Amino acid sequence: GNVHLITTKERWDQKLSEASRDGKIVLANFSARWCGPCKQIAPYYIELSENYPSLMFLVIDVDELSDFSASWEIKATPTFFFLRDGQQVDKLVGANKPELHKKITAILDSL
């Protein structure tokens, strides 16, 4: 059960601490419940999370964390950030399955 749903600024702040603790890169999926391209990739994202234990997979519910989201300047859903210690290593706007998988692949070998 490797995708964590973030609903609170405290739970975000906790999970980022854990990943830092363990030298994991955080994949954050800023997405929405009633969002069609977000539903489209949601099972793929769970499947990815099973296959890549050295990434911490988060989903950020943008309807719930609306202020935190404006702060990350979310302009479309889903939006993905790869974060190391909070610094963006990469970013993907949209449910693009191939592209997401390629970014995970690239961040994994090298960083």
From Swiss-Prot:
Disulfide cross-links: 35-38
Gene Ontology cellular-component terms listed: cytoplasm
- Subcellular location as annotated: Cytoplasm
Q: Does the keyword Electron transport apply?
A: yes
Q: Where is this site: Contributes to redox potential value?
A: 36-37
Q: Which UniProt keywords apply?
A: Cytoplasm, Disulfide bond, Electron transport, Redox-active center, Transport
What is annotated as the active site? 35 (nucleophile), 38 (nucleophile)
Q: Which residues form a coiled coil?
A: none
The chain positions of domain Thioredoxin read 1-109
Q: What does this protein do?
A: Participates in various redox reactions through the reversible oxidation of the active center dithiol to a disulfide. The H form is known to activate a number of cytosolic enzymes.
UniProt family annotation: Belongs to the thioredoxin family. Plant H-type subfamily.
Protein name per UniProt:
Thioredoxin H-type
- Span of the entire protein shown here: 24 to 134 of 139
